[PDB]
Amino acid sequence: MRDQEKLSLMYARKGVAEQKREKEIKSELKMKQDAQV
DNA sequence: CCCGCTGCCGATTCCGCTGGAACATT
DNA sequence: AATGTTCCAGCGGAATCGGCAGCGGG
């Protein structure tokens, strides 16, 4: 990838994906620990 | 869009010199 | 009044150092 901007926008989508994943996993961890065996 | 380094560059502090303004004298 | 001294103010060198950008990765 020789285009820095296109790579940056692809990782804009990517990084917002990991941000959403982190938020949802942080939310899930509460009851995941609550009911874990 | 993020995230992270990492150059580097700006500003501070500390000096010191100069200039200008004020002093006090015969 | 003529001048020398003192005082105040301003500029710059030098060292430090922190963060501001920009640049790759995730």
Curated annotation (Swiss-Prot):
Q: Which residues does the annotated region (May split the end of the DNA molecule, with the two strands separating around the region) include? A: 5-33
> Cellular location of this protein?
Nucleus; Nucleus, Nucleolus; Cytoplasm, Cytosol
Entry superkingdom: Eukaryota
PTM annotation:
Autophosphorylated at two clusters, the T2609 cluster and the S2056 cluster. Autophosphorylation induces a conformational change that leads to remodeling of the DNA-PK complex, requisite for efficient end processing and DNA repair. S-nitrosylated by GAPDH.
Q: Disease linkage in the record?
A: Immunodeficiency 26 with or without neurologic abnormalities: A form of severe combined immunodeficiency characterized by reduced or absent T and B cells, recurrent candidiasis, and lower respiratory tract infections. Some patients show dysmorphic features, severe growth failure, microcephaly, seizures, and impaired neurological functions.
Subunit structure as annotated in this protein's UniProt entry? DNA-PK is a heterotrimer of PRKDC and the Ku dimer (composed of XRCC6/Ku70 and XRCC5/Ku86). Formation of this complex may be promoted by interaction with ILF3. Component of the core long-range non-homologous end joining (NHEJ) complex (also named DNA-PK complex) composed of PRKDC, LIG4, XRCC4, XRCC6/Ku70, XRCC5/Ku86 and NHEJ1/XLF. Additional component of the NHEJ complex includes PAXX. Following autophosphorylation, PRKDC dissociates from DNA. Interacts with DNA-PKcs-interacting protein (KIP) with the region upstream the kinase domain.
| Family to which the UniProt record says this protein belongs | Belongs to the PI3/PI4-kinase family.
Role noted for this protein: Serine/threonine-protein kinase that acts as a molecular sensor for DNA damage. Involved in DNA non-homologous end joining (NHEJ) required for double-strand break (DSB) repair and V(D)J recombination. Must be bound to DNA to express its catalytic properties. Promotes processing of hairpin DNA structures in V(D)J recombination by activation of the hairpin endonuclease artemis (DCLRE1C). Recruited by XRCC5 and XRCC6 to DNA ends and is required to (1) protect and align broken ends of DNA, thereby preventing their degradation, (2) and sequester the DSB for repair by NHEJ.
Name of the protein: DNA-dependent protein kinase catalytic subunit
- Native organism is Homo sapiens (Human)
Which stretch of the full sequence is covered here? 2733 to 2769 of 4128
